[PDB]
Design a protein around this nucleic acid. Structure first.
Lengths: 187, 168, 106, 97, 150, 124
RNA sequence: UCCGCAUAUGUAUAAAAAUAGAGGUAGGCUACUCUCCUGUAUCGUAGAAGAUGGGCGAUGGUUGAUGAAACGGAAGUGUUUUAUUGACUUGUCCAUGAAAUUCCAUGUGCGGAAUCGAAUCCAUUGCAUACGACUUUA
RNA sequence: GCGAAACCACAGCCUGGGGAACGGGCCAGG
RNA sequence: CUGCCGAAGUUUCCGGAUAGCAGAAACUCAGAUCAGUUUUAUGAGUAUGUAAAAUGAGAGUUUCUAGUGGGCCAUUUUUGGUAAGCAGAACUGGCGAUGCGGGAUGAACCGAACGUGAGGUUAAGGUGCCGGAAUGUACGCUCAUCAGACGAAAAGGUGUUAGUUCAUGAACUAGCCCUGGGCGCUUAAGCGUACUACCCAUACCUCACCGUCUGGGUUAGCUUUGAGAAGCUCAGACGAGUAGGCAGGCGUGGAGGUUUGUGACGAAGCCUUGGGCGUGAGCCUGGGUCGAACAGCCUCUAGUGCAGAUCUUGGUGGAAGUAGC
RNA sequence: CUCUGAACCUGUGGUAGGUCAGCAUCAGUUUUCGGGGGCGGAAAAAGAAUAAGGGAAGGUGGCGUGUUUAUAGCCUUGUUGUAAUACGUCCACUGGGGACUGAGGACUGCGGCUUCGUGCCAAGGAUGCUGACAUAAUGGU
């Protein structure tokens, strides 16, 4: 629909291929894309399925394990990286594990065309990228899975403060008669 | 979409046959040209009546008399496969005879990887009795208490701001 | 500063092309907010511009513009075909274009 | 072609005579240029054609006959004073004027 | 990739180009002639509108072995006046009703050089019309095809 | 009938840029295996008669006039009846004395001169 | 530090969580109700690119400028709290000015010096060693 | 200090495939 | 240099006479014939053949006159086969003289055959991203830990989905899964079917222009003046091309004529990211350099045009300041 | 007397040429939405609706069992004034939006208006109304 200068995507529950194709098309469209929570991506198939896929990849190159490096590789294969246009589009992508401080205070959007709950049939086994990465070499799973609660607790406290603050204007809305005097316009 | 045509045909009269017999079949085709060709092919392989010596005397599309009433249709079909000889019978619950035949074609072309030319319908009947229903799936659909949640909900404007509710 | 921008934002996606042949004379433009080929009928014939800046202060100004018009929709998703007075440079893929509201039939 | 006809309530304009507004009324003054080849050099001409008084008189007459019409209907005087613009999320193909 | 047997028949129908069209009197000598070139042509029954609009928009006549458009009734009269055809409507009437001088009226008309259909053909074009293609006899469905090529 | 050019680039001989011994004057390739003669994709174009320009606008300069070569005052006076169709072009080997005489004569005849400023100075 | 030279268009939107659903819910762990069913929403949006005044309502919302204290570690680099000092205050009502644009075209960098440190060569050394280059000490 | 000659279509990182070597030169990748 | 025409690539006897294919000339001829075509019916054996209907095209010639006298991809029919493949005939067309869209890429697979362009529309293929185009609609199969998208194969499946038969079950049938281009995809971005949208070829349509061919008009040369009749004008169609054939042009040295031609106020040559003309060979010109001759047109003439010849002569490179002295 | 647009004063009279851009009336080609109107089909089938009968996915009553409109109704059948709608097809019926093109160059022609018209017209190919610039605009290398 509409574009922003920087789009932050919360990759929790997003399929790897579906999100990467959407992100790659947005990168080539002239947009700066930041994907957070790259360790919460999902891949269709059981744990052993993509395990052998990655183990075969290890047999083949600079083997990267971090979840963002997995996602960065998936996006790169969907770009014309052999040309200057593809390389320039790649540099506009920032994939990270977790939500760093510059991004945890910014709004994060989701891609419905890539969400697992709207694309995978219920009862289908799936493999999370973060869990899959943890046994193939990634060693920062525990510390990032511990820090998220600290971010969630701080963010939850912020939402409660914002919700409590909003209650005042919400009550003051219906308090003002002009809200309903000219509410015939649908507002 | 498919259309049900009733086609009546007969051989060209000759000195041996002053007046020939009339042969009528109810067959499904997207257009009248397909129905006439299928009718001649059925006559050629059932009555050994050549198209050159025969002519179509009538053709009329038939609409479903009660398209707003749920019905159960049993279809007897003949499958031409690698073996080339199969007899099958299926039951579909829908509102029109056309829909059941379309559903049958979709089912067999999917499961059995068949084609329109190979599949030939001997008969389509309407099962008006619950006891006459044979398939367990259709019997469930006729139970007094159909009660199930909405299936396969799945519901440009990319980059939605909030998580989908995808529920009640 | 929200008392301006009589135009609509747009992006220069590519030229008209087959798999291996490009046609730079006509460009594919994605007007934002237009999400189907029926909504692309509103923007047909509208003036579109590419606005960029160059080092030289020629004309006593730092900004230069390439004008164009929207000819027809492209595809099903609301992209349009635009012909510019000068063919848009290939470096402007993913750049921003402005779709005015004139010539208006509204 | 360079104008959007909004659906705002119409103003009463039948009162003001508009027969004086023709293409010659708005036409730019034709070039006569009475000079000599002594002041064209040195640029000693300073030719200016600032708007004459009758144009302001016509504008005042139109304003006087129009202001009560826009004053009677509410929320219209400053509506004409405001400047139209597009904000975030505005889709002109969907918005109606 | 056309067999010489089919090439000869199409040259007899004046179908030298793809999308070209002609009016043909339907008889036994033609019925089995079209059977040979069935994979390479499509044909059917034209209604009045198809005949009427073809002669108007795409109507050209062979005058001194030249493709002269039928923009005036004097063009038709100067070539088919001996058969009492004096206008486009007389030419349409001779073609649509297959009059006594149909062959002269039909041979006067240049083969209709039609355009590609607006909307395309079906997904597979060279299958027979019965099997979901676009080749062979299609009866009243030729009109719907002509409305795209006109 | 404004002047239209079907093509403005020249036709350069194949491999003329690779080799200095090979000039850029067009030569029709004769090799059967050469892709330029076979007219493959991406290869350079070849002079065809379809590239020929309109007969009415042929030989016409961008201002609509045809260049007429002039060597003396007799040649300029020839364009008295064709000053709207032809422009005078003084030859390169005409001296600066004759060039002056040609230019004054062409001015009275209303004849455009393509190179009226060559080999001369001005003094007002 | 001196000298010379060249001179984006509203950039507005922060819980988490699953669909075999959650969020929050009085009350005192609940109970049950409510909400969704996307942001087509919310925040902002007048002013000759946004003037001059008279003001009025509220005696206050935005902010600039400084003085600030707290919070923010994951890459805190920003979230507030303000103390004031000035303004616009679209909250609202008036009076002036807009035009002949009389139909679209829209300090920063280099090259020099006088300086302050540091490093290498250097007194060096074999610790290193085809040479490079390396390590110590004047 | 003095001082050659042979040679020279042209560039030159690998894995696969391009059927007639395809390779170094194409295609898909690292 | 451009334009136009354009093969054969093989029957028969036997290096050729041929024939045949492709052109030139000399003809006659629509009240006439011709055909990689279909017919009518009966003749003979659905095929085959027949004389005289449909459709298209105006046709028949006589003479001589260049080039070729192979194969490959194979399909199909087909003979022998032989572990099995495979081989042998004919047939069929294509490539061979043919570029273009697709097929991930591709000498033979699917589309389509080509003057220069604008616009439109398609074919074959496709529309998750790379990549132009629906992360379209509807109905089904499958979760593959070696999915699928492109013989170890017999079977095994306490792997299934649907149905048929007999009838509580039993088996059977058919199809998916396992064992035996990239990124990625899984109620798919796989497979099957149906349905609308969309993408684009040198293809199709409309228009402009180039050229070729064909047909027509044009003199008491009318104040429409547009008679270089070798001119002017109107119309329609067409455009691959090896060998080969035929036209028209560009350029060079010298000769006869001509321009009452150019030139020390600068000829010729040379240089130049100056400008222009021609489809092209080429030509004109500005500036710079330069210093004595030179050109256009008509005709004549020839030691007349170069990228190749392990070409000739001369000059100069990388190797290389290397091997070395 | 005529002529020399003859020189200058007088006019400050009147018209003013090459690249770009905008719009409007058109013609050619084309694409894309919409409004109506005929004619076909089982003169659509349905349905609303007049109505007789029946059964149960037995409703409602009666006693989960059986019921027959109860205090729901369902289906079938003829049937209530006719239809409507969808689909197919046609209009020499009609209203908008977009894009590319402007070849030709006195007059002829075929047509339509017009009482007739040196008449007018969308009828053998684009014109009209404007705006911007020479120290710039526009293109080329």
């Amino acid at each position: 629909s509409e574009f922003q200068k920087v789009v932050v995507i919360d990759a929790k529950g997003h399929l790897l291929g579906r999100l990467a194709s959407v992100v790659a098309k947005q990168l080539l469209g002239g947009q700066k894309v930041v994907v957070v929570r790259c360790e919460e991506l999902n891949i269709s198939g059981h744990f052993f399925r993509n395990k052998l896929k990655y183990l075969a990849y290890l047999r083949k190159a600079f083997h990267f394990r971090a979840p963002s490096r997995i996602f960065q590789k998936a996006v790169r294969g969907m770009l014309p990286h052999k040309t200057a246009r593809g390389q320039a589009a790649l540099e506009h992508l920032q994939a990270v594990e977790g939500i760093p401080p510059p991004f945890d205070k910014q709004k994060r959007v989701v891609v419905p065309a890539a969400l697992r709950v709207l694309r995978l049939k219920p009862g289908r086994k799936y493999c999370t990228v973060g869990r899959l990465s943890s046994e193939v070499g990634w060693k920062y799973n525990d510390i990032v899975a511990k820090l998220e609660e600290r971010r969630k607790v701080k963010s939850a406290a912020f939402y409660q403060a914002k919700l409590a603050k909003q209650k005042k204007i919400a009550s003051a809305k219906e308090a003002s008669p002009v809200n309903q005097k000219l509410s015939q316009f649908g507002y | 979409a498919l259309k049900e045509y009733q086609v009546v045909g007969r051989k060209v009269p000759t000195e041996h046959e002053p007046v020939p017999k009339l042969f009528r079949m109810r067959l499904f085709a997207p257009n009248e040209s397909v129905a006439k060709s299928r009718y001649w092919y059925f006559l050629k392989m059932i009555n050994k009546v050549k198209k050159a010596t025969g002519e179509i005397v009538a053709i009329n599309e038939i609409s479903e008399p009660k398209p707003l009433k749920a019905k159960v249709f049993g279809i007897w079909i003949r499958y031409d496969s690698r073996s080339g000889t199969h007899n099958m019978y299926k039951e579909f619950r829908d509102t029109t005879r056309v829909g059941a035949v379309e559903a049958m074609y979709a089912d067999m072309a999917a499961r059995h990887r068949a084609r329109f030319r190979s599949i030939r319908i001997l008969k389509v009947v309407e099962v008006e009795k619950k006891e006459d229903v044979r398939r367990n799936y259709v019997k469930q659909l006729l139970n007094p208490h159909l009660k199930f949640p909405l299936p396969h909900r799945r519901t440009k404007k990319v980059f939605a701001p909030h998580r989908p509710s995808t529920f009640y | 500063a929200q008392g301006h921008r009589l135009y609509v934002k747009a992006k220069h996606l590519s030229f008209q092309r087959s798999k291996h042949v490009i046609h730079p004379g006509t460009s594919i433009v994605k007007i934002e907010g237009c999400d189907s080929k029926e909504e692309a009928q509103f923007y047909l014939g509208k003036r579109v511009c590419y606005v960029y800046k160059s080092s030289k202060a020629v004309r006593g100004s730092k900004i230069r513009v390439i004008w164009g018009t929207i000819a027809r929709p492209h595809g099903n998703s609301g992209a349009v075909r635009a012909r510019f007075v000068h063919n848009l440079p290939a470096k402007t893929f993913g750049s921003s274009l402005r779709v005015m509201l004139y010539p208006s039939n509204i | 072609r360079y104008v959007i006809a909004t659906s705002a309530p119409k103003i009463d304009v039948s009162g003001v005579s508009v027969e004086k507004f023709t293409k010659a009324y708005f036409a730019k003054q034709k070039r006569s240029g009475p000079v000599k080849k002594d002041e064209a050099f040195f640029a000693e001409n300073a030719p200016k054609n600032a708007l004459p008084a009758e144009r302001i008189a016509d504008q005042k007459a139109v304003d006087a006959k129009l202001l009560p019409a826009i004053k009677a209907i509410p929320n219209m005087k400053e509506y004409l004073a405001a400047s139209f613009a597009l904000s975030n999320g505005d889709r002109p193909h969907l918005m109606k004027f | 990739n056309i067999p010489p047997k089919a090439r000869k028949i199409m040259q007899l129908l004046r179908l030298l180009q793809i999308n070209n069209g002609i009016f043909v009197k339907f008889n036994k000598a033609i019925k089995e002639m079209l059977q040979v070139v069935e994979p390479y042509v499509t044909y059917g029954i034209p209604n009045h509108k198809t005949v009427r609009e073809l002669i108007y928009k795409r109507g050209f006549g062979k005058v001194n072995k030249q493709r002269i458009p039928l923009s005036d009734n004097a063009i038709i009269e100067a070539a088919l006046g001996k058969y009492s055809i004096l206008s486009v409507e007389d030419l349409i009437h001779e073609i649509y009703t297959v009059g006594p001088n149909f062959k002269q009226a039909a041979n006067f008309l240049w083969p209709f050089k039609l355009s590609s259909p607006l909307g395309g053909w079906r997904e597979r074009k060279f299958k027979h019309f019965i099997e979901g293609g676009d080749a062979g006899k299609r009866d009243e469905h030729i009109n719907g095809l002509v409305q795209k090529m006109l | 009938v404004n002047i239209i050019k079907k093509r403005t680039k020249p036709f350069k001989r194949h491999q003329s840029d690779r080799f200095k011994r090979v000039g850029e004057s067009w030569r029709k390739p004769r090799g059967i295996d050469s892709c330029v003669r076979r007219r493959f994709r991406g290869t350079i174009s070849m002079p065809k008669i379809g590239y020929g320009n309109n007969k009415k606008t042929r030989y016409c300069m961008p201002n609509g006039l045809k260049a007429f070569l002039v060597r003396n005052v007799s040649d300029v006076e020839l364009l008295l009846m064709h000053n709207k169709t032809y422009a005078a072009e003084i030859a390169g080997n005409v001296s600066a004395r004759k060039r002056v005489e040609i230019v004054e004569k062409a001015r009275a005849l209303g004849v455009k001169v393509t190179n009226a400023g060559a080999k001369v100075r001005s003094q007002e």
